[PDB]
Amino acid sequence: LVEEALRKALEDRYLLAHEAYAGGVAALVVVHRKEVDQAKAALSRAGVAE
Amino acid sequence: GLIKSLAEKEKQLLERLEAAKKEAEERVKRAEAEAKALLE
Amino acid sequence: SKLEAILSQEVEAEIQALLQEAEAKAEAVKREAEEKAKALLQARERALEAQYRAALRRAESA
C-alpha cells in the first residue's frame, strides 16, 4: 500500500528498502533530497508512520 | 533498495568537489603571486 | 541508480563552476596589478622631471 503511494510520488528515483524484524519490516525510502516532500507525502496518504 | 550503490557514489563525488576548490584557489593565488611580483 | 546519477552530474557541475569562478577572480587580480604598477611608475617619473626642470631653473637663475 505504501509502496503504491511511494511509487506514484517517487517512481523509480527511489530505491526502496525493508529489513525484517517480524511484525513487519523496518523500512527506508531513499530519495533525493529534493524528492523528500513527495516521499513524506506518500507516507501521509498511506497513514504509515515514522 | 540498491543501498550500496547510492552509499558509495555520495563519497566518491564529495572528495572530488573538495579537490576542485583547492586547484581553483590556486589559480587565483597564482595571479596573486604575479600581482605581488609585478608591483614589487 | 538513476538516483545517484543526478547526484554525480550535480556535484560535478559544481566542480566545473568553482574552477571557472576562480579563473575570473584571477583575471580580476591580474587586472589590478597591471593598472597599479603602471599607475605607480608614471607619477613618480613625472614628478622627477618636474623636479628637474625646476632645479635647473634655480641654477640658471644663479
Residue numbers in the entry:
A (entry chain N): 152 to 201
B (entry chain K): 21 to 60
C (entry chain L): 2 to 63
What does the article say, verbatim?
The V/A ATPase from the thermophilic eubacterium Thermus thermophilus (Tth) is one of the best characterized rotary ATPases. The a-subunit is connected to the A3B3 stator in the V1 domain by two peripheral EG stalks which form a peripheral stator apparatus (A3B3E2G2a1). In addition, the dodecamer c ring composed of two transmembrane α-helices, the d-subunit and the DF shaft constitute the central rotor complex (D1F1d1c12), which rotates relative to the surrounding stator apparatus.
After refinements, 57.9 % of the particles corresponded to state1 and gave maps at a resolution of 5.0 Å, higher than those of state2 at 6.7 Å resolution and state3 at 7.5 Å, containing 15.2% and 6.3% of the particles, respectively. Similar densities were also assigned as ADP in the map of state2 and state3 in the nucleotide binding sites, albeit the densities were less obvious in state3. However, the stalk region of EG1 adopts significantly different conformations in the three different states. There is a pivot point of the right handed coiled-coil of the EG1 at both E/94–97 and G/104–107 in each state, resulting in a circular motion of the stalk.
